Design a protein around this ligand. Structure first.
Ligand SMILES: [Ca+2]
Length: 156
């Protein structure tokens, strides 16, 4: 736990547990950043659902519990505006993969937007969990920074 944070990805010389969702690719970039000098670039998307993801440990993010999730995202080109969605990917009690929305924000180019939900409740039957970031309907390259999973209510 922490200053309440369970995880806090700054992107300074490390990707942390972040990986690509779909056939995309994620890597550190110094072209833009919200804090420090780097951020996580997400590119090679061929469908809007592609993006950046991180597995969530059920020992720490108990299903049925409420938690805080936060991230800042931006893009520079490829669209005139986009809708960033921060989400939870999981498998339910029936063995079916579900996608639940944690937060979503629409923004134009060259502008950091804050994806944030201090009170997100994880469905009680969830297993094999992943928090992910995508855009709703484009395949633009985008950047994320300051990725945080924390205690319900944490002010970010
Ligand atoms: Ca950074």
């Amino acid at each position: 736990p922490d200053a309440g944070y369970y995880y806090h990805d700054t992107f300074e010389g490390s990707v942390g547990q972040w990986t690509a969702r779909g056939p995309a690719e994620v890597l550190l970039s110094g072209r833009t950043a919200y804090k420090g000098s780097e951020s996580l670039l997400v590119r090679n998307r061929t469908a809007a659902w592609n993006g950046a993801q991180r597995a969530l440990n059920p020992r720490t993010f108990v299903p049925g519990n409420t938690y805080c999730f936060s991230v800042v995202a931006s893009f520079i080109e490829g669209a005139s505006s986009t809708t960033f969605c921060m989400k939870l990917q999981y498998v339910d009690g029936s063995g079916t993969q579900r996608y639940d929305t944690i937060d979503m924000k629409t923004v134009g180019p060259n502008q950091w937007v804050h994806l944030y939900n201090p009170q997100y409740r994880i469905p009680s039957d969830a297993t094999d969990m992943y928090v992910y970031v995508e855009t709703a309907d484009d395949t633009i390259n985008f950047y994320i920074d300051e990725a945080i999973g924390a205690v319900a209510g944490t002010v970010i």
